[PDB]
Each structure stands twice: as structure tokens, then as C-alpha cells.
Symmetry: C3
Subunit: 332 residues, 3 copies
């Protein structure tokens, strides 16, 4: 027996009315595939003589080891897109433009414009607040070795005439000078001062000074010859006063020096010395002393003399000449 089977092209089977017997093999000549009958279905409705089931295969791949599009997408969704995020380097880039609290160098203007909680009072107020209580450095060090400039090192301005606080307040406790101004010896000379003050306020002194020294001056001024030449500073003075009219004014009645004791002093009110030797003075009682010959381009009104060293008045000379003239008239 060399057995052959009912056979024809797949597509020919497809429209054959032939019913294969149960288990009778039919062969598709162009595919080489077989099918067996079930006694009823036409060929195209039988299945193949052998399994076509993925789950009956051998050497299946590891399908469950594989990532699903869904699962992957869920996981990718938790990750940050490059686009929406700064790189470490772009981060340093930006942070390096920012001032460390630990310190740094400004190259531009630091403006302050306080919104103001209360902005406090005392040693916890101020837009800039510096406490050096645990340290040995300066607070604010401003300097310039530039040749010329358009602005000062520090400027304090108040705009409104009602302004009811100081521009600069110094409350000092310590052992050296509260405020110290050195204007050291020019090479190229200035026609100006270490401290210069102008006030146009007619109801207050330009400068007020109170002290309570045991044995010193409230203000001590010293002039020092700038030269070794004995008489070079001959037009200088420790204190110079001028008394002037207003521009286009009619003149002035202001006094030069006014000295008073509102509570009364027993001290010399004006005392003038050279080489620490009294030369002239006004005693607390307004009497005066002078050490050398003096001159008045005028007369002197004074009281009649009683002591021998008293200056004689004209009245006194005249009466003594007149007494002598009478007494001597003993032509009788």
C-alpha cells in the first residue's frame, strides 16, 4: 500500500461540497497541509490535523519578561523631562550670580526701600543693621583712592522741614574720641576745612556744644605754626570771628563774643596768658587786670581816687589846685 488521499488546491476545497468521513484525510496540494473529516463539516471548516495553539508550543519566548507600553508609560510619567528642569551646571550658573550670606563682592547698586514691619527702634532697627559686639573689625569701611569723583564717600539727606530725627546720631561710650576727623598735611593745598558747617536757621545756633570738664576747656583749640619760621603764621589766629550783613541787607547789630554765667561764676570770665603767665583778665566781677602799659586814644571816665596808686580825676586835680589857691590867699 502506497496511500494517496482526496486532494485539490486549498481554494478548490474551499468551495467543495465534499464531506470527508470521520478521520479521513484530505490534502491541500498547494499548501501541503492536511485536514481530517468529522463526518459533517465541509473542508474549509475542519481544522488542521495538528495543533495551532501558542500555549502548546515549545521554546516559547519569555513574553512576561517583556515591558508593556502601558507599564513603561506609567513609569516614564514619574520621571522629569530634561526640558522642564535645570542641569547641575545651569544651576551653578544661576546660583553663582547670587550673594552668599557668608560673603561676596557686589558689582552693582544695592538699593534699599523698606516695606517696614515697624523697622524697630534702637539696636534692632535699620535697613542695614550691624552688630560688632563679638568681633574686632570695623562696621562700615568706605574709602577711595581715586583721583577725583562726582560723589562723596557718604551722603545723608533729609527732604522735609518737618523731619523730626537726626541725619547722624552718635551715642558714644568708650576711652578714645567718639568722632575723629584727621585732615593730614596736604601736598597739593586745599582752601577748605576738615569740618565745615553752614546753617541758615535763624532760630537755632549753627553749632551747640556742652561739656562738664573738671580742669579743661569745653572746646580746646590749638593753633600750631605750620613753619619753623618764628613769624610765618603772623596773620593766623586760634579763633577768627567775622560779623556780616545779609547780601543787599542794610547792615548788622550782631555781637562778636558774648560771655555770660546764667548761674554766676566766681572764675575769671576772660583770662589771657603768654607762656602761662597771666597778662590780662576780667575778673568775675567785671573788674580788669592788665600787665603792661596801655593806651586809650580817648579819655577815661573813672571814680575819684582814694588810694595813692589810683588815677587821679580832673575833678580831683582841680579841687586840690583850688584848695591851694584859697589857702595860699593869706594876703591878709
Amino acid at each position: 500500500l502506497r496511500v494517496q488521499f482526496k486532494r485539490m488546491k486549498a481554494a478548490e476545497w474551499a468551495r467543495s461540497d465534499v464531506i470527508l468521513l470521520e478521520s479521513e484525510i484530505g490534502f491541500e496540494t498547494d499548501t501541503g497541509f492536511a485536514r481530517a473529516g468529522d463526518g459533517h463539516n465541509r473542508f474549509s471548516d475542519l481544522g488542521y490535523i495538528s495543533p495551532l495553539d501558542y500555549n502548546l508550543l515549545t521554546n516559547k519566548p519569555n513574553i512576561d519578561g517583556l515591558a508593556t507600553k502601558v507599564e513603561t508609560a506609567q513609569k516614564l510619567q514619574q520621571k522629569a523631562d530634561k526640558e522642564t528642569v535645570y542641569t547641575k551646571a545651569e544651576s551653578k550658573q544661576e546660583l553663582d550670580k547670587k550673594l552668599n550670606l557668608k560673603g561676596g563682592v557686589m558689582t552693582g547698586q544695592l538699593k534699599f526701600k523698606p516695606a517696614a514691619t515697624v523697622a524697630y527702634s534702637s539696636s534692632t532697627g535699620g535697613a542695614v543693621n550691624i552688630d560688632l559686639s563679638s568681633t574686632r573689625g570695623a562696621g562700615v569701611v568706605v574709602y577711595s583712592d581715586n583721583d577725583t569723583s562726582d560723589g562723596p564717600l557718604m551722603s545723608l539727606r533729609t527732604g522735609k522741614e518737618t523731619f523730626n530725627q537726626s541725619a547722624l546720631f552718635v551715642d558714644y561710650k568708650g576711652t578714645t574720641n567718639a568722632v575723629n576727623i584727621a585732615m593730614r598735611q596736604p601736598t597739593t593745598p586745599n582752601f577748605s576745612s576738615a569740618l565745615n558747617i553752614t546753617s541758615g536757621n535763624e532760630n537755632g545756633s549753627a553749632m551747640q556744644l556742652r561739656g562738664s570738664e573738671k580742669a579743661l576747656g569745653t572746646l580746646k583749640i590749638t593753633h600750631e605754626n605750620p613753619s619753623i619760621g618764628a613769624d610765618y603764621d603772623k596773620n593766623a589766629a586760634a579763633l577768627s570771628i567775622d560779623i556780616v550783613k545779609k547780601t543787599n541787607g542794610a547792615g548788622t547789630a550782631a555781637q562778636g563774643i558774648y560771655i555770660n554765667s546764667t548761674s554766676g561764676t566766681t572764675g575769671k570770665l576772660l583770662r589771657i596768658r603768654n607762656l602761662s603767665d597771666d597778662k590780662f583778665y576780667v575778673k568775675s566781677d567785671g573788674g580788669f587786670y592788665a600787665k603792661e602799659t596801655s593806651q586809650i586814644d580817648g579819655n577815661l571816665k573813672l571814680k575819684d581816687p582814694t588810694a595813692n596808686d589810683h588815677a587821679a580825676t580832673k575833678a580831683y586835680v582841680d579841687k586840690a589846685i583850688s584848695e591851694l589857691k584859697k589857702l595860699i590867699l593869706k594876703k591878709h
Copy 2:
């Protein structure tokens, strides 16, 4: 020949003791599948007449093109979770609250509390250090056009009586004024000064001033009539001094003006002029000059005269009256 094969349900085969001959086909009526004998194994242990091997299939999918769960997880693990990272926008958000070194506007308090390396000495110390050596702007510009306030523009306080540095130090080289205070003409008048100083320190002058002017005053004061009215400032003065007791004190012996030359001057110690014409002065020798008639509500003690323009003493008048009285007594 229409061939049929030993056949029965799969499950019936499953417990059949029938051994198919080698290559003899047996058919599973309910699955339509065939198996061939090997001459020994029962049906359930033969395999199907045709291959069930994934690797013999055609039109396999691209299994190796597919991502494995493991591989994907490795790669996802290198990526940043959204949660642990700032967005660009949240990054700008935070950086915009930080001060650019290039400049910016503070709206709150900048406190300093130095930890202090040494905090230096000179022009590289200070919590705030400003160098304007290459520029034409001011250093610290503080101003206020507010109507009233609770605090000054600048405040310097030192708390401890041992404190051995200044509150403000000015070391000036230049061609204009080191320190300049303008208190310009009030519309609403203040009863106060451009500069006001009080000291309760009994062992030091409230203010000390040294200069070495060739032809100027160490301190120059000018009073200017505030009015065009010739005599409006009649109670004003360039310099006003008061000398007072302590509250509930017994009084005072302080002098008004004290002038000395510790090294001896040949200059006039006090010189008083009007319209630049000497009117009164005390010479270096304590002698005085006065230009007009003067008055003493008292006597004057002086030396006997020798020149004709010398004031006569009482001694001198008396002796001349007495000499005349003797001489004339030639009643003999």
C-alpha cells in the same frame, strides 16, 4: 481506498492501553488532531504528527526588538523622578528672591553679625567694605523725604566704657571739605543746630580742635544777619558762652575764655576790629590798646606817670600840690 483511522476522544485515548504501530495514525475526534505510533508509547505519550516548536515557525515577531522589564527598569533608575527635583519655573521662583551680586532692591532688613576671621584692619576690613577707587559714585547714600520718622538716617552706638575705638573715623586727603554739614534755610523753623554735642566727661574736652593755618583761624566763625534789617540780629553773636552749675550744685568757678601760648607767641593775644580797623587789643605782653573813650565804674590802680600823656596818680598830684605848698611858703 477511503482510509479511516483508529479514533476516539482525546480523553478516551488518554486512558487507552492501545499501542499504535510505528507510523500508524490515531485520530482525536474532538480535537481533530492526529498522532503517530512509535510501536511502544501509549497515545498520550506520542507527540503530534507535526512540529510545535516556536523556533520552526514562520512570520515570527521581532521578539528581540522588544524591551525587557529588567533592562527598562535599569534605564529608568538613572532618571530623575519629578517629585525629587525642581522644575525650571520653581527654580526661577526661588532664585528671584535672591540678591544678584550685580544689584537689586532689598525690601527687608540686612543684619550683619560677623563671625570674624580677624575682620582685618585698614582698607580691607569691615562687615561692609566699599572701595570707590575706580568709580565716580557715592559710597553710602542714605536719604529720606518722609515727613516724620522714629529713627535717624544713621546711628552709631557703643555700649562699653572700655571701648577703645572711635564711633566714626575720618581720614581725609583732598581739595574740598572732609566733612560738610549744610542745614539750609528752614520754612518751618527748628530750635536746633546743624551740629550738637554734649559730653558729661569731666576728664576730656567735649571738642578738641588743632590746626596749623598760615594766615587763617583754626576755627573761623561767621555770623550773617538773617534779615536785611540793619539791627534785627541785635541779640545775636558769633560766639556765645554760658557758664553753669550742676543741677542742685552749689555753683561754679569755671572760666569763660582761657587763652594761653604754651610756647610763647609774639602775636596779639586778643585782637578786635570793625571794618578791618583795630579797635581794641591785648598785645603779647598783656598790655592793652583801646581806640575810644572808655569807662571804669571804679578806680584804676596804675604806676606813677613819667610821660606827659600818662594818667597821673593820686600820689603824683598830691606830691606836686605838696611841693608847691612848701616852695610857696617863702613867708620868710
Copy 3:
């Protein structure tokens, strides 16, 4: 019929020259697989009697639901690597070292070194610019309750003799003092001042002061006894002047006090009072007044008397003695 088929090992078939008839089954004894002839091809070139096509399988897996290596890689490439990005925490870390514009505490030096656009002029210049126009706090509050230190609270230095701006400029409008210095009562005494100024500038006054007070002093000084003891301050003075030579200098000709009216004043040029009672004064015309007995350790040159209270000259006494001597010589 129990049918058996031409059969032999796969590998034996592989090199058999046997041509199976069309649809004649041949069996591979070691694999259990069948093939059917096509009437021409050798065994090894027939295919199996049943389909080996992935696309004809049942229970296929969801291959298209699976992620491809390519697709996954594309998506991973848009995500940020952990390595190239800061964590939220590392971000806070860095930002917390930066100064909030809203405020913060510096612990190190803030240097300024302006690059300078123009650095302005007026109330919009300065490396540090503070405007308190809408607020009630101080601007710059510098203080120290430390015991001793190496640096002052504030320091202003200018290096170049050409420097053509001030160290400190105060432009004040308001109702209290522009600048106020309090050096309150020491427990441990300093040998120093509230304000101390030295200038070595021979061409400008160390301090200049101008005011225009209606009824006050341009400078008002008050000395206050520091003790209740009437005469404790007996060596004190409101104003103390010294006039000194240069070290190794030949001496000095500087004046003590110089008073002038460049425009001419009708006021008393020097006026000295005690308990507000005139005691001594120099009138605008250089004449003087004194209230008590005075002394000159010398002579007084003055004009011949004309009134009775005028001091007599020697000339005048002498002429009256001489007139009496003549007149009385009527021995004829």
C-alpha cells in the same frame, strides 16, 4: 486496514532520493513528524503536513502591547538623568546660603567694588542706596557692645590729594539736630573728646562755621560744673586756646582771638556778663567799659581830660601846678 507509511530517521530522509507521491505520507521515526509528497521534491524539501505560521496560531500573545527597545529609548532620551540634575534637597541646601531680598543675616564681609554705569549723582547714586521716604526706621544702624576692638564703627578714607569730594556730606532739613553727638557720663574716664579734629592744612581753617541766628550765638558753648562743689571746676573754661610753635620751630606769631566785622557791626564786639549783668565790654567803636576797679602794672597813655570824671594826664596836672606857680608869683 492498519496503515503504515514509508518511514526512516529525519537525517536518513535528508539524504534519500525517494520521491513521495502527491499526498503520500512519509514519517520521520525520531521526530514523529509527517510530510506529504508533491510528486517531485525530495523529502527534506516538502513541508510538514500542518501549518507553522505564527499568524495562524491561536492564543497569540499581545505582541503589539509590548514596548520596543527603540520606542523606549526615544522616550527615555527626553528624561533627565539623576546625575545631571539637583534634587529638591540639594537645591534648598544651595539657596539657603543666599541672601533673600526680603532680608537675612550676613556672617561674612560684603565688599563693594562698583563697575559703574555712571553710579549716578544725587538720591539715586551710591553702591549702597537707602531711601526711607515711606518708613519710620533708621537707615544704617551700627553698634557694638564689645569691650574693646581693633576698628571703629565707621571709617571714611580718601587717599589722593586731588580728591575733589567730601568724605561725609550732610544736607539736612528738619526740626531736630542734623548731627548729634552724645558722649554720656563715663564710669571709667576717657582723656578724650566727643569730637576731635586735627588739620595740618596751612591754607584752610581746620573748622569753618557760618550761621545766621536772629538772637543766638552761631556757636553756643556751655560749660557745666561736673560736681556740686562750687569751686571744683576752678581750672575749667568754656573755651580754651593754646598757641604753639612747630616741633623744632623757632616760635610763633599767631594771634589768639581775632574778631572783625568785614561789613561793620553796631553791636558790642566783646561782651562779658555774670548773672546776666554786663561787667565788661568793647563797643563797636573799640571803646571799652568796665564795671569794677581795675589795675595796670604800668602806665596808661590817654588824652587830656575835659570832663570832671576824666583821668587827668601828667601834662594836665603839670600845667595846673605851673599856672598856680605863675599866678601866685605876685611878689610884685
